[PDB]
């Protein structure tokens, strides 16, 4: 039972379930609680649990326990203070220091690299799914859309990734998609950390493709082999020109720009990977600054 847990407040709903802030009456430990109502145990919870028990990493949210009672299923998590989106909104007047964007991106990639090294796709990387403590760490959360993939991949659920962060290969309906979809999402978030507005906030699939095309250029066979043969490619697509990356994220380093242009490469194969990304010269001076938050 949850005799030992006192709910403090609700904090959100994501993918499935509901997350409460709660407190361990006996230990004093503040936790997060994901509650599931019980068609059997949801496919989403089955995946989140088994995979998160496998993934133990400082940058991946720790699952502490799994409790029953019925007809409920409680997941018990390490608590964290704030999601990235709220933090970005708190930093509206003052900005987010570059050494902190750097640290955060560095940490995120580590955690993504761990995932991918353990045949795991996140598939829902967005700022509401990234948590931060006061000590300076950022962690990946909400593994509801996650799935264990195989080598090589076969076709998976097409629904995936919330719109603003969805990779072009999903949007254009490629039959296979891989680790490159998590990099894409991470690239958008990188830009968003710098500009504090979402990079491509579309309202429909076509809107999104167009917003991406206006920023990165409408892709052709030269920049992305096989693109004009994709299921949702339309020849009637407006042919926009590519613009300088210096205008896409104006405050950014030459090395920031390099890193970003690689995380947002059209071709999923050409798109840099998390593992490789850690070696990028952007991170040469990387440290671990605290966020200074309340």
């Amino acid at each position: 039972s949850m005799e030992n847990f006192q709910k403090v407040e609700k904090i959100g709903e994501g993918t499935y379930g509901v997350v409460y802030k709660a407190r361990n009456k006996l230990t004093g430990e503040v936790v997060a609680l994901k509650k599931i109502r019980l068609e059997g145990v949801p496919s989403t919870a089955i995946r989140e649990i088994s995979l998160l028990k496998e993934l133990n990493h400082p940058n991946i949210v720790k699952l502490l326990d799994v409790i029953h009672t019925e007809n409920k299923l409680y997941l018990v998590f390490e608590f964290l203070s704030m999601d990235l989106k709220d933090f970005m909104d708190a930093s509206a007047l003052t900005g987010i220091p570059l050494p902190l964007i750097k640290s955060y991106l560095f940490q995120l990639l580590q955690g993504l690299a761990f995932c991918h090294s353990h045949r795991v796709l996140h598939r829902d990387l967005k700022p509401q799914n990234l948590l931060i403590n006061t000590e300076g760490a950022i962690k990946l959360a909400d593994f509801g859309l996650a799935r264990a993939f195989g080598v090589p991949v076969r076709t998976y659920t097409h629904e995936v990734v919330t719109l603003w962060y969805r990779a072009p290969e999903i949007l254009l309906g490629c039959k296979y998609y891989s680790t490159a979809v998590d990099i894409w999402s991470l690239g958008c978030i990188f830009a968003e950390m710098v500009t504090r507005r979402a990079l491509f906030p579309g309202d429909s699939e076509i809107d999104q493709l167009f917003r991406i095309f206006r920023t990165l250029g409408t892709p052709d066979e030269v920049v992305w082999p096989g693109v004009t043969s994709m299921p949702d490619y339309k020849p009637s697509f407006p042919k926009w020109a590519r613009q300088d990356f210096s205008k896409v994220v104006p405050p950014l380093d030459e090395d920031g720009r390099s890193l970003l242009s690689q995380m947002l490469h059209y071709d999923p194969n050409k798109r840099i990977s998390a593992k490789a990304a850690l070696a990028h010269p952007f991170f040469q001076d990387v440290t671990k600054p605290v966020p200074h938050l309340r």
């Binding site: 145990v41 496919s43 089955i46 991918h116 045949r119 080598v151 090589p152 076709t155 990977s273 593992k275």
Partner: protein
């Protein structure tokens, strides 16, 4: 070749050892036997053919079954309920569109109720401590396939047939890890169709040689030979289809030479 192939292979190799069931669990099962297990596994191949399920789902289900039976005694009349929960859970894990619970109650022919199937799903989950991302023979074969020079669809189908035959007979195949069952399966397939052998590149990747795979390769060679006489025929039937290039109809070689 991506940047995670070696990391994933390494991790999968680590994980098969931890996900391994107990080898002599059937000797500890008072009411169930190897033959009864053969019947259950064969039935799940039927179920997977009915609902067009991925082969991965099938291997996962069998892994779950064996791991559950390594710690929980079951009577003969309930083995099929365990089997049904496994298949369900495997579906929820692996499939884009799993079948409803209702559809699972139907294929048991109203032996068990919905409430029974649901409560068993929990029990399995709990007994397996929710750890369901087990490596399978199938997961290794698909990696091994990448080492074909060049690709041959008949080799892949035959490999997966042989690997699927290992699922039926706990004696002997329980004493082998999936990565090894897959090496045997891949070589046997490859030698039958093209007359080629385990590739040196796969030696570099896996550490396995024909000498090291031989014990399993000998056992699998026998299964393949006795397959048309085998009491369970569902897998053979499945692999007559053009989807699998009619590989079950092929003539097995009589000697391997090693």
């Amino acid at each position: 070749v991506p940047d995670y192939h070696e990391d994933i292979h390494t991790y999968l190799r680590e994980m098969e050892v931890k996900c391994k069931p107990k080898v002599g669990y059937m000797k500890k099962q008072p009411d169930i036997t190897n033959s009864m297990r053969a019947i259950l596994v064969d039935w799940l191949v039927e179920v997977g053919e009915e609902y067009k399920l991925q082969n991965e789902t099938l291997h996962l289900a069998v892994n779950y079954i064996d791991r559950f039976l390594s710690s929980m005694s079951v009577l003969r009349g309930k083995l099929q309920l365990v089997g049904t929960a496994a298949m369900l859970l495997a579906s929820k894990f692996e499939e884009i569109y799993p079948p409803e619970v209702a559809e699972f109650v139907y294929i048991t022919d109203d032996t068990y109720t919905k409430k029974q199937v649901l409560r068993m799903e929990h029990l399995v989950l709990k007994v397996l401590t929710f750890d369901l991302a087990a490596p399978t023979v199938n997961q290794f074969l698909t990696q091994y396939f990448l080492h074909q020079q060049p690709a041959n669809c008949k080799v892949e189908s035959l490999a997966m047939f042989l690997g699927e035959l290992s699922l039926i007979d706990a004696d002997p195949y329980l004493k082998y890890l999936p990565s090894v069952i897959a090496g045997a399966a891949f070589h046997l397939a490859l030698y039958t169709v093209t007359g080629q052998s385990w590739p040196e590149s796969l030696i570099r990747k896996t550490g396995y040689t024909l000498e090291s795979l031989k014990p399993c390769l000998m056992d699998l060679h026998q299964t393949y030979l006795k397959a048309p006489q085998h009491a369970q025929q569902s897998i053979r039937e499945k692999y007559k289809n053009s989807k699998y290039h009619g590989v079950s109809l092929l003539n097995p070689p009589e000697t391997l030479n090693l």
